[PDB]
Amino acid sequence: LTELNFWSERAANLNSIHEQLTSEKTQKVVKVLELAKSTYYPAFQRLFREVEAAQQEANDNVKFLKLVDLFKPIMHTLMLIWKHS
């Protein structure tokens, strides 16, 4: 299941890096660097903007995603998933 595991991994990894970047020592590093205020810090601002929306949207679709003769009614579930999603 490449798609399901792909987006689950994306949500987990990006949340983990998102509090690798919002944690305490990183915050002190950003302010100690902000005793210089030259150029780089708007670039990390925009890259944090890259982080947050992808993080939350990955979380949303992870919460959404949660013999075959006997298992055609399961296909109704599939249409209903496409119906519901």
Binding site: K63, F64, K66, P73, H76, T77, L80, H84
Partner: peptide, 17 residues
């Protein structure tokens, strides 16, 4: 010579709201 499956899947989608 399957109504209850519909309703329950609606319920589980509403649990994921």
């Amino acid at each position: 010579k399957t109504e209850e499956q519909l309703k329950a899947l609606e319920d589980e989608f509403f649990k994921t709201t």
